[PDB]
Amino acid sequence: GPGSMNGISVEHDGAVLRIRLDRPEKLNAVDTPMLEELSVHIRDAEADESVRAVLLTGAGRAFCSGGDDTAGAADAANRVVRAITSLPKPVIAGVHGAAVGFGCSLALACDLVVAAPASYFQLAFTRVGLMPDGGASALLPLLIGRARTSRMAMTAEKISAATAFEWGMISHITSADEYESVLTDVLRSVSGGPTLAFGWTKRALAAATLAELEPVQAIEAEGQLALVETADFREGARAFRERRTPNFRGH
Amino acid sequence: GSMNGISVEHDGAVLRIRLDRPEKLNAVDTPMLEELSVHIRDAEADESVRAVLLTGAGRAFCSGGDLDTAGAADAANRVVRAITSLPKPVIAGVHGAAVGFGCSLALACDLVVAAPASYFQLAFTRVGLMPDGGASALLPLLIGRARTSRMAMTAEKISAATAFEWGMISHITSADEYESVLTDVLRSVSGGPTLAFGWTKRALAAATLAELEPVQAIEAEGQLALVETADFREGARAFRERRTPNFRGH
Amino acid sequence: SMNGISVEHDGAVLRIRLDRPEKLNAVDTPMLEELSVHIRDAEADESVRAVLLTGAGRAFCSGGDLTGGDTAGAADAANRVVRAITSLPKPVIAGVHGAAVGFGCSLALACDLVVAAPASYFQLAFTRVGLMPDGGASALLPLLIGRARTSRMAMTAEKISAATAFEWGMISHITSADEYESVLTDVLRSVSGGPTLAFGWTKRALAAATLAELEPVQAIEAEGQLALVETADFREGARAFRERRTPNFRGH
Amino acid sequence: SMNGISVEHDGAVLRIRLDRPEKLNAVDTPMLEELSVHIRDAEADESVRAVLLTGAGRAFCSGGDDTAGAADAANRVVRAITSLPKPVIAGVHGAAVGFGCSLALACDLVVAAPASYFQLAFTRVGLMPDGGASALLPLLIGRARTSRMAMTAEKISAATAFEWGMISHITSADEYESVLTDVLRSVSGGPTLAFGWTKRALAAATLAELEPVQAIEAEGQLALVETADFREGARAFRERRTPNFRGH
Amino acid sequence: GSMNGISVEHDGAVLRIRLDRPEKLNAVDTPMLEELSVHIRDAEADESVRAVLLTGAGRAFCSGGDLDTAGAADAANRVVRAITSLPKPVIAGVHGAAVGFGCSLALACDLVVAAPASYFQLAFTRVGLMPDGGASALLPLLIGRARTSRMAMTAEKISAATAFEWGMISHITSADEYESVLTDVLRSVSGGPTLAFGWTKRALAAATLAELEPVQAIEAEGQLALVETADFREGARAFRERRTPNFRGH
Amino acid sequence: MNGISVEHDGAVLRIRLDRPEKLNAVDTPMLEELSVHIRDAEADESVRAVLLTGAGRAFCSGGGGDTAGAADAANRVVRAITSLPKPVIAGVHGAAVGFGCSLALACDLVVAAPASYFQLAFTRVGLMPDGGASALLPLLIGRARTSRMAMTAEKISAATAFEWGMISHITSADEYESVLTDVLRSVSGGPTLAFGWTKRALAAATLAELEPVQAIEAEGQLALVETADFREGARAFRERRTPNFRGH
């Protein structure tokens, strides 16, 4: 969008760093420089003493539709997730519409997710013969357990905001026409809270839950690099772009 | 054509592995547990196999150990390790009882499609024994520590519906639809991107199963301790005499 | 009671009652240290097959006192209480009525089974005075309810009802109507009459599976609490609680 | 067993069992009339304190297999259950479909097996609900869920039926038979006259429209069996096809 | 103190009517019910009253009829009728037991705010009696007929959370919030458009209460018969004695 | 014309509330017009289902204008939908408020978007429910939930409405339009005469009080528009402030 650098829009609204994914025309699909740009602003929030909370949202119809340079983009995505979880300040995702593939990992890296009634979470990777990325394989089971994670990954089904909330995937659900006001309420309340105690709470929860994040991210990066060489990905990438149902062979 | 209580057939790209002792409610002994792992190993080597179906013939999926402690323990642990390390999806079609190691067996699989009358139960402590097969490691990353403690300590039957609501299992079926949904899930996963499924499993295994082996070692050691106790003696005796055990904590 | 802890034998059950009802069983270091030995001393006691943990008065436990100025001391003692319960090779049951707040939440959730009264609740109120979770709550909670519901509890300081805690899988048992006492009795009877050695082995396997980060996380919480009491936000939090008004946090 | 119904006494319980398992307890007029008679005769029988209604075989009752006569007899069976001053418990295992649904839901208590289900399958063959189901279901699950069941002819699981308030009791795991047994034992040993009175008061609160609605349903069914849509529906069912409905 | 077991007070625009025989868990007799009726009806002509709050003293909202059958049954019916036809909103603040007529009484009100440990029970048949106050008519248009049959035939306790989830009652509370939610509801309602509420009530009553009087007359007749029965005598004796009644159906 | 737009689409008559700039708020001519098109679906042999939706951001925001006339027209719309011997499906997205709620709930099926909501906002301005909502809602969700809705004027989410049995269908994610399309295709190809009869029976079962109740609501609203609280309610609504109600 106009005024955004590498598809990321950043502004300060008092104590809030407002970061907005800003390629609405591609439903906020991400590439390498957009990911790198995102993580810079996330990292730089730490040393910025006016920032007490980060708000992550997306412009247009969707929060984030996921990845489009396999090694490169995978690394940059993994780094964004790491930057969000290691930032000693609260990061809130406001998720409306689709949160798909890395879009899903991205929301779930955040401390709190406020989900609009029509929003959804989906690992669509397998639909193109690919595997989850961003660390989703580590983030999701500590949210919803192994069996529902395994289902998300293998079936590529959409999980509604209501279901994601019932499963403990996300901290907040909204209903009716209240998405915006609840998001505003949560943001104002968190950005006025004891930021240092939030930081220390994050460090302890990170140790409790993220021990495997980086080894799992390594396996995903390695897997995706192998999977883009397979006959199934070529078929997957072709059948998606043609609005045809793919014919997978296991090769 | 079953061997050591296991039948196997190919149906296109699916290896169908079926526990075949309905005359004993698919209770398992060591030969049967060893036999299972053989076919999981065949699945890995067989280029035509794109998914494994695991079910029990008859009323029960698997009613756990017939009640050679160390050998059974090792065989049970190895079946679960084989299933979770197989880089191809394994679907458990759970009908009726999944009890004791039966429960660990279903929960080892990547997806579980449960019939409405199926149930999941750690009956171990009814006879003075402890969970096995890695159940102590598998259950908490499904349903959390508190519900796992309760299952193990009270030995209550958990219904398919409840197990589904808790996150224990991926799929539930209702009415008379169990077979058709199971068939649908099988057809879908076996025509799916098998290599992407193997990688997914690998990433998820690293995220969730780091303690599986250490925990299985603790369980085998404990079961070996516990079969020596007077409580196990009473438990087994009370089971056979169709009565309530009188445990004393020794 | 000695140091705010009552201890009574009742058949094969060791009953440990937190007994400072005049402060809603808010805890200090003496009280925690006292609690901890009575827990490990149940290992030794051949008559004890189960431990029951409850609180006298209106609340299970309102958590850390905020008196004493013994920050590292309290944090250490609270940590050791939680470790002793998870490590005792005998079942420990929390019967929770009323408030389980701050370390009171950590305490209940360290137990093997929790039987919650209908009006009971679980709450990480620490952040309302600018402090962070303790006892090792940060490691316990995610393996109960997942990371998202934990972050919320810790960051918003909301009360979680007994009913909600049960749905989430935070606690093993829920009661309703006037049935709390009777259900508690039923569960204590059955557990204390159970295969105690089997229970102890089950606990060891389950601790190996779920508590690998308990110690490192407790050390992080203890360092964090030490840093947090020096902050302007804590001075303001404490002052606001004292003056019953809303704190004005600054992030310093 | 006569006209597809077996009746036996087990202490203070009248066990009435739909006994056409080969046809999944599909019903005709003489079966429906047989059923009415024994339900009604439970009243005079001093030794009966509870009526158990179940079906033999795979299904509780698959519904209608002589339109006017069948509708009247089906309507009589329901009035007979609802007005019997003694509790009737339906033990529902498997399918309760069409009139088999109305039959179950007329009972005072319903104990559902986990794989059991409830369905108004009538419109799949171009017909409407009968037995008085159009009156029974809204005072169980409300008008919107009823409209849905009737118009989509979807199967409602026991679990969902329980959650909606359609049925009094759900069972799980392998416990169906035990629970049914405990419920039957408890009800048959209870204060039968108070149950009789409790029923009368409930019937007056809930069943004012029952006979009037039953009359509309009987009239409707007579009209619908003349339609091309019934003609196509009945044949499609027999030939295992999707029916071509045209609204005439 | 109170007159005939009822205490009345004004709190701003709220008339608070309190069941005040805590020693008997607010069990009700004919004079208490007649008093109750008088004060509910009093609200109609008192212009300072914009809402009625009904609560119970002591440990329970109301344990139902004190074990004058005709007199009491008729008086209970008139209490329910006075609540339902009062053109002002009536709120039950229910804590603890609301049993027998105590359930009917709560369920007559326009809104019910239930404390987390409160519960609703039709305990009638446990003493060989039937529901009263119009409960047979009130309950089915709340929770449906099957759940009503169950409540009446089994005399099981329905927790506040379950009653809420069933649509039996308008408001649930949890944790230590009962008093403050109740206060908030009362403030909001008593400061609301009372006349609009009156009319709202009137239309709703015409939609749902058409059977309330005929059903009440059936309950009254039934209780008149049931107290002549052996089963009532066994039920009363066994309740008093804290043991299992042997019912005969006579 | 009169803020209603109509169109045939195969066997579906699409009726769309068409005053998006006012969030489909309704007045007498719009209500009278809506009646006419609902009524004319009966005699139109190409029509097998009616679809009711709203253009713009809201299904229907509900009801200066004449109270007597508008209330009457509203009542007539609700009687028209419920007596039409063809399925009427409301596709509800956004707000269904006041009569907007009545109008949805009058229909045979309702397919609700995930951000949709249902609300009786009347008492917030010192008025009472209308269109027969007082009769419709208790046979959907029970008297307790109805009383709370009417008295508190709170918004009920689509999810909650579905949980409560208020509405037949719920949608989630981006699937609203797809589900609505599928339900309309399946219902418009169904046994339309069977559906007509089913409706008639359901109506006799559940709508006996509809007209007595609609009369009470029409009388009441006429009284309430004369009150000081309505003057205060409408002022406070207009001025985007909190009303100070006094019970006069």
PDB file of C-alpha atoms in Angstrom, chain A residues 10-204:
ATOM      1  CA  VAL A  10       3.719   1.150  11.009  1.00  0.00           C
ATOM      2  CA  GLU A  11       2.420   4.014  13.173  1.00  0.00           C
ATOM      3  CA  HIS A  12       2.497   5.024  16.828  1.00  0.00           C
ATOM      4  CA  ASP A  13      -0.847   5.564  18.556  1.00  0.00           C
ATOM      5  CA  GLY A  14       0.259   6.773  22.018  1.00  0.00           C
ATOM      6  CA  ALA A  15       1.756   3.742  23.811  1.00  0.00           C
ATOM      7  CA  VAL A  16       0.824   1.355  20.941  1.00  0.00           C
ATOM      8  CA  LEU A  17       3.011   0.370  17.996  1.00  0.00           C
ATOM      9  CA  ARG A  18       0.389  -0.320  15.303  1.00  0.00           C
ATOM     10  CA  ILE A  19       1.837  -2.748  12.785  1.00  0.00           C
ATOM     11  CA  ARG A  20      -0.493  -3.506   9.833  1.00  0.00           C
ATOM     12  CA  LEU A  21       0.131  -6.077   7.074  1.00  0.00           C
ATOM     13  CA  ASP A  22      -0.491  -3.978   3.998  1.00  0.00           C
ATOM     14  CA  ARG A  23      -0.797  -5.932   0.731  1.00  0.00           C
ATOM     15  CA  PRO A  24      -4.620  -6.159   0.737  1.00  0.00           C
ATOM     16  CA  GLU A  25      -4.617  -6.931  -3.005  1.00  0.00           C
ATOM     17  CA  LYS A  26      -2.832 -10.265  -2.311  1.00  0.00           C
ATOM     18  CA  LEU A  27      -4.819 -10.803   0.960  1.00  0.00           C
ATOM     19  CA  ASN A  28      -1.602  -9.953   2.759  1.00  0.00           C
ATOM     20  CA  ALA A  29       0.396 -12.896   1.373  1.00  0.00           C
ATOM     21  CA  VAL A  30       3.954 -12.556   2.568  1.00  0.00           C
ATOM     22  CA  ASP A  31       7.360 -12.574   0.854  1.00  0.00           C
ATOM     23  CA  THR A  32      10.910 -12.362   2.189  1.00  0.00           C
ATOM     24  CA  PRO A  33      11.402  -8.569   2.364  1.00  0.00           C
ATOM     25  CA  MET A  34       7.926  -8.124   3.953  1.00  0.00           C
ATOM     26  CA  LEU A  35       8.818 -10.661   6.622  1.00  0.00           C
ATOM     27  CA  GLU A  36      12.230  -9.027   7.188  1.00  0.00           C
ATOM     28  CA  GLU A  37      10.532  -5.621   7.406  1.00  0.00           C
ATOM     29  CA  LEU A  38       8.003  -6.968   9.930  1.00  0.00           C
ATOM     30  CA  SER A  39      10.630  -8.452  12.249  1.00  0.00           C
ATOM     31  CA  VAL A  40      12.667  -5.203  12.277  1.00  0.00           C
ATOM     32  CA  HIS A  41       9.698  -3.269  13.631  1.00  0.00           C
ATOM     33  CA  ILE A  42       8.958  -6.045  16.114  1.00  0.00           C
ATOM     34  CA  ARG A  43      12.561  -6.118  17.341  1.00  0.00           C
ATOM     35  CA  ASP A  44      12.849  -2.320  17.458  1.00  0.00           C
ATOM     36  CA  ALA A  45       9.776  -2.099  19.722  1.00  0.00           C
ATOM     37  CA  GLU A  46      11.906  -3.350  22.629  1.00  0.00           C
ATOM     38  CA  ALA A  47      14.323  -0.373  22.763  1.00  0.00           C
ATOM     39  CA  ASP A  48      11.469   2.072  21.964  1.00  0.00           C
ATOM     40  CA  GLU A  49      10.447   3.387  25.372  1.00  0.00           C
ATOM     41  CA  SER A  50       7.201   4.959  24.182  1.00  0.00           C
ATOM     42  CA  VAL A  51       5.953   1.487  23.091  1.00  0.00           C
ATOM     43  CA  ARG A  52       4.040  -0.491  25.712  1.00  0.00           C
ATOM     44  CA  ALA A  53       2.112  -2.777  23.362  1.00  0.00           C
ATOM     45  CA  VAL A  54       2.263  -3.881  19.724  1.00  0.00           C
ATOM     46  CA  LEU A  55      -0.967  -4.246  17.709  1.00  0.00           C
ATOM     47  CA  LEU A  56      -0.677  -6.543  14.696  1.00  0.00           C
ATOM     48  CA  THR A  57      -3.537  -6.494  12.119  1.00  0.00           C
ATOM     49  CA  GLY A  58      -3.918  -6.795   8.324  1.00  0.00           C
ATOM     50  CA  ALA A  59      -5.497  -4.425   5.806  1.00  0.00           C
ATOM     51  CA  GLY A  60      -8.229  -5.594   3.386  1.00  0.00           C
ATOM     52  CA  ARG A  61     -10.363  -8.724   3.565  1.00  0.00           C
ATOM     53  CA  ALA A  62      -7.903 -10.973   5.482  1.00  0.00           C
ATOM     54  CA  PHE A  63      -5.474 -10.924   8.360  1.00  0.00           C
ATOM     55  CA  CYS A  64      -2.859 -12.925   6.352  1.00  0.00           C
ATOM     56  CA  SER A  65      -3.175 -15.602   3.666  1.00  0.00           C
ATOM     57  CA  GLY A  66       0.334 -16.989   4.189  1.00  0.00           C
ATOM     58  CA  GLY A  67       3.424 -17.396   1.959  1.00  0.00           C
ATOM     59  CA  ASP A  68       3.469 -16.618  -1.805  1.00  0.00           C
ATOM     60  CA  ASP A  69      12.794 -18.394  -2.459  1.00  0.00           C
ATOM     61  CA  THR A  70      12.031 -21.355  -0.122  1.00  0.00           C
ATOM     62  CA  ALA A  71      15.085 -21.282   2.216  1.00  0.00           C
ATOM     63  CA  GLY A  72      14.931 -17.425   2.387  1.00  0.00           C
ATOM     64  CA  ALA A  73      11.198 -16.937   3.128  1.00  0.00           C
ATOM     65  CA  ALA A  74      11.122 -19.867   5.553  1.00  0.00           C
ATOM     66  CA  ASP A  75      14.015 -18.327   7.507  1.00  0.00           C
ATOM     67  CA  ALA A  76      12.448 -14.879   7.553  1.00  0.00           C
ATOM     68  CA  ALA A  77       9.066 -16.234   8.740  1.00  0.00           C
ATOM     69  CA  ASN A  78      10.730 -18.272  11.479  1.00  0.00           C
ATOM     70  CA  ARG A  79      12.512 -15.107  12.545  1.00  0.00           C
ATOM     71  CA  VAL A  80       9.291 -13.075  12.784  1.00  0.00           C
ATOM     72  CA  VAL A  81       7.749 -15.711  15.084  1.00  0.00           C
ATOM     73  CA  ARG A  82      10.911 -15.650  17.255  1.00  0.00           C
ATOM     74  CA  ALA A  83      10.938 -11.867  17.356  1.00  0.00           C
ATOM     75  CA  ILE A  84       7.274 -11.776  18.548  1.00  0.00           C
ATOM     76  CA  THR A  85       7.752 -14.421  21.273  1.00  0.00           C
ATOM     77  CA  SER A  86      11.045 -12.964  22.563  1.00  0.00           C
ATOM     78  CA  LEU A  87       9.807  -9.353  22.658  1.00  0.00           C
ATOM     79  CA  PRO A  88       9.445  -8.417  26.380  1.00  0.00           C
ATOM     80  CA  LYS A  89       6.209  -6.510  25.555  1.00  0.00           C
ATOM     81  CA  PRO A  90       2.644  -7.767  24.800  1.00  0.00           C
ATOM     82  CA  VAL A  91       1.830  -8.275  21.156  1.00  0.00           C
ATOM     83  CA  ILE A  92      -1.892  -8.521  20.341  1.00  0.00           C
ATOM     84  CA  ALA A  93      -3.094  -9.901  16.961  1.00  0.00           C
ATOM     85  CA  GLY A  94      -6.433  -8.491  15.779  1.00  0.00           C
ATOM     86  CA  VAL A  95      -7.559 -11.206  13.402  1.00  0.00           C
ATOM     87  CA  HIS A  96     -10.372 -10.612  10.927  1.00  0.00           C
ATOM     88  CA  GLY A  97     -11.093 -12.868   7.906  1.00  0.00           C
ATOM     89  CA  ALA A  98      -8.500 -15.488   6.910  1.00  0.00           C
ATOM     90  CA  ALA A  99      -5.405 -16.512   8.903  1.00  0.00           C
ATOM     91  CA  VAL A 100      -3.905 -19.162   6.688  1.00  0.00           C
ATOM     92  CA  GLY A 101      -0.564 -21.002   6.619  1.00  0.00           C
ATOM     93  CA  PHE A 102       2.041 -18.626   7.953  1.00  0.00           C
ATOM     94  CA  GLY A 103      -0.867 -16.195   8.645  1.00  0.00           C
ATOM     95  CA  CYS A 104      -2.010 -18.712  11.221  1.00  0.00           C
ATOM     96  CA  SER A 105       1.522 -19.156  12.735  1.00  0.00           C
ATOM     97  CA  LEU A 106       1.817 -15.399  12.833  1.00  0.00           C
ATOM     98  CA  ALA A 107      -1.370 -14.796  14.858  1.00  0.00           C
ATOM     99  CA  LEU A 108      -0.511 -17.661  17.237  1.00  0.00           C
ATOM    100  CA  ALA A 109       2.965 -16.385  17.953  1.00  0.00           C
ATOM    101  CA  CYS A 110       1.229 -13.394  19.612  1.00  0.00           C
ATOM    102  CA  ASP A 111       0.439 -13.149  23.320  1.00  0.00           C
ATOM    103  CA  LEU A 112      -3.283 -12.475  22.845  1.00  0.00           C
ATOM    104  CA  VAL A 113      -5.425 -12.917  19.706  1.00  0.00           C
ATOM    105  CA  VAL A 114      -8.718 -11.028  19.329  1.00  0.00           C
ATOM    106  CA  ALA A 115     -10.717 -12.841  16.638  1.00  0.00           C
ATOM    107  CA  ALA A 116     -13.620 -11.357  14.650  1.00  0.00           C
ATOM    108  CA  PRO A 117     -16.712 -13.618  14.362  1.00  0.00           C
ATOM    109  CA  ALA A 118     -16.038 -14.513  10.693  1.00  0.00           C
ATOM    110  CA  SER A 119     -12.276 -14.959  11.056  1.00  0.00           C
ATOM    111  CA  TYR A 120     -10.711 -18.445  10.722  1.00  0.00           C
ATOM    112  CA  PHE A 121      -7.464 -20.359  11.195  1.00  0.00           C
ATOM    113  CA  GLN A 122      -6.199 -22.927   8.682  1.00  0.00           C
ATOM    114  CA  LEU A 123      -3.072 -24.885   7.750  1.00  0.00           C
ATOM    115  CA  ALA A 124      -3.759 -25.082   3.973  1.00  0.00           C
ATOM    116  CA  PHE A 125      -0.186 -26.232   3.224  1.00  0.00           C
ATOM    117  CA  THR A 126      -1.063 -29.833   2.504  1.00  0.00           C
ATOM    118  CA  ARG A 127      -3.570 -28.724  -0.131  1.00  0.00           C
ATOM    119  CA  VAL A 128      -0.487 -27.783  -2.290  1.00  0.00           C
ATOM    120  CA  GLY A 129       1.652 -30.720  -1.067  1.00  0.00           C
ATOM    121  CA  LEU A 130       3.581 -28.661   1.515  1.00  0.00           C
ATOM    122  CA  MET A 131       4.064 -28.780   5.319  1.00  0.00           C
ATOM    123  CA  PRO A 132       3.356 -26.260   8.117  1.00  0.00           C
ATOM    124  CA  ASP A 133       5.818 -23.416   8.605  1.00  0.00           C
ATOM    125  CA  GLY A 134       6.715 -20.559  10.961  1.00  0.00           C
ATOM    126  CA  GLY A 135       6.887 -22.979  13.903  1.00  0.00           C
ATOM    127  CA  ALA A 136       3.179 -23.846  13.703  1.00  0.00           C
ATOM    128  CA  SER A 137       4.115 -27.517  14.400  1.00  0.00           C
ATOM    129  CA  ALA A 138       5.416 -26.382  17.829  1.00  0.00           C
ATOM    130  CA  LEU A 139       2.982 -23.519  18.567  1.00  0.00           C
ATOM    131  CA  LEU A 140      -0.246 -25.392  17.919  1.00  0.00           C
ATOM    132  CA  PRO A 141       0.121 -28.445  20.171  1.00  0.00           C
ATOM    133  CA  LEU A 142       0.782 -26.275  23.225  1.00  0.00           C
ATOM    134  CA  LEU A 143      -2.489 -24.490  22.351  1.00  0.00           C
ATOM    135  CA  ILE A 144      -4.910 -27.223  21.282  1.00  0.00           C
ATOM    136  CA  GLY A 145      -3.075 -30.529  21.760  1.00  0.00           C
ATOM    137  CA  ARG A 146      -1.513 -32.972  19.307  1.00  0.00           C
ATOM    138  CA  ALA A 147      -4.646 -34.627  17.939  1.00  0.00           C
ATOM    139  CA  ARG A 148      -6.366 -31.417  16.809  1.00  0.00           C
ATOM    140  CA  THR A 149      -3.054 -30.074  15.471  1.00  0.00           C
ATOM    141  CA  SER A 150      -2.540 -33.277  13.540  1.00  0.00           C
ATOM    142  CA  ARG A 151      -6.050 -32.856  12.104  1.00  0.00           C
ATOM    143  CA  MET A 152      -5.489 -29.217  11.110  1.00  0.00           C
ATOM    144  CA  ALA A 153      -2.216 -30.212   9.352  1.00  0.00           C
ATOM    145  CA  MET A 154      -3.375 -33.342   7.571  1.00  0.00           C
ATOM    146  CA  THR A 155      -6.917 -32.273   6.566  1.00  0.00           C
ATOM    147  CA  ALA A 156      -6.264 -28.544   5.859  1.00  0.00           C
ATOM    148  CA  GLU A 157      -9.711 -27.645   7.216  1.00  0.00           C
ATOM    149  CA  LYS A 158     -10.772 -24.164   8.283  1.00  0.00           C
ATOM    150  CA  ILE A 159     -11.218 -23.689  11.998  1.00  0.00           C
ATOM    151  CA  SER A 160     -13.728 -20.943  12.784  1.00  0.00           C
ATOM    152  CA  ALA A 161     -12.943 -18.264  15.374  1.00  0.00           C
ATOM    153  CA  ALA A 162     -15.575 -19.800  17.667  1.00  0.00           C
ATOM    154  CA  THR A 163     -14.004 -23.263  17.430  1.00  0.00           C
ATOM    155  CA  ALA A 164     -10.438 -21.846  17.806  1.00  0.00           C
ATOM    156  CA  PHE A 165     -11.600 -20.115  21.027  1.00  0.00           C
ATOM    157  CA  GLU A 166     -13.318 -23.277  22.345  1.00  0.00           C
ATOM    158  CA  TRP A 167     -10.103 -25.287  21.753  1.00  0.00           C
ATOM    159  CA  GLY A 168      -7.908 -22.724  23.562  1.00  0.00           C
ATOM    160  CA  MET A 169      -6.128 -21.766  20.325  1.00  0.00           C
ATOM    161  CA  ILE A 170      -6.702 -18.053  20.867  1.00  0.00           C
ATOM    162  CA  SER A 171      -7.245 -15.872  23.936  1.00  0.00           C
ATOM    163  CA  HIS A 172     -10.292 -13.789  22.849  1.00  0.00           C
ATOM    164  CA  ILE A 173     -13.379 -14.268  20.726  1.00  0.00           C
ATOM    165  CA  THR A 174     -15.775 -11.567  19.602  1.00  0.00           C
ATOM    166  CA  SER A 175     -19.373 -11.742  18.451  1.00  0.00           C
ATOM    167  CA  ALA A 176     -21.949  -9.545  16.612  1.00  0.00           C
ATOM    168  CA  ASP A 177     -20.560  -6.121  15.562  1.00  0.00           C
ATOM    169  CA  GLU A 178     -18.263  -5.873  18.563  1.00  0.00           C
ATOM    170  CA  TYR A 179     -14.890  -6.983  17.065  1.00  0.00           C
ATOM    171  CA  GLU A 180     -13.534  -3.425  16.792  1.00  0.00           C
ATOM    172  CA  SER A 181     -14.606  -2.194  20.245  1.00  0.00           C
ATOM    173  CA  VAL A 182     -13.395  -5.294  22.088  1.00  0.00           C
ATOM    174  CA  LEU A 183     -10.082  -5.079  20.205  1.00  0.00           C
ATOM    175  CA  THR A 184      -9.900  -1.434  21.271  1.00  0.00           C
ATOM    176  CA  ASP A 185     -10.787  -2.252  24.873  1.00  0.00           C
ATOM    177  CA  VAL A 186      -8.199  -5.068  25.143  1.00  0.00           C
ATOM    178  CA  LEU A 187      -5.542  -2.887  23.529  1.00  0.00           C
ATOM    179  CA  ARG A 188      -6.143   0.166  25.773  1.00  0.00           C
ATOM    180  CA  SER A 189      -6.147  -2.015  28.869  1.00  0.00           C
ATOM    181  CA  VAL A 190      -2.946  -3.976  28.008  1.00  0.00           C
ATOM    182  CA  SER A 191      -1.022  -0.860  26.814  1.00  0.00           C
ATOM    183  CA  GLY A 192      -1.752   0.824  30.138  1.00  0.00           C
ATOM    184  CA  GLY A 193      -0.732  -2.223  32.179  1.00  0.00           C
ATOM    185  CA  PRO A 194       2.464  -3.142  34.049  1.00  0.00           C
ATOM    186  CA  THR A 195       4.627  -3.632  30.913  1.00  0.00           C
ATOM    187  CA  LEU A 196       7.659  -4.969  32.822  1.00  0.00           C
ATOM    188  CA  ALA A 197       5.582  -7.628  34.587  1.00  0.00           C
ATOM    189  CA  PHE A 198       4.126  -8.554  31.193  1.00  0.00           C
ATOM    190  CA  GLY A 199       7.707  -8.905  29.866  1.00  0.00           C
ATOM    191  CA  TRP A 200       8.746 -11.178  32.688  1.00  0.00           C
ATOM    192  CA  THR A 201       5.521 -13.188  32.345  1.00  0.00           C
ATOM    193  CA  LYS A 202       6.379 -13.730  28.671  1.00  0.00           C
ATOM    194  CA  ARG A 203       9.954 -14.867  29.459  1.00  0.00           C
ATOM    195  CA  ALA A 204       8.637 -17.495  31.921  1.00  0.00           C
TER     196      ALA A 204
END
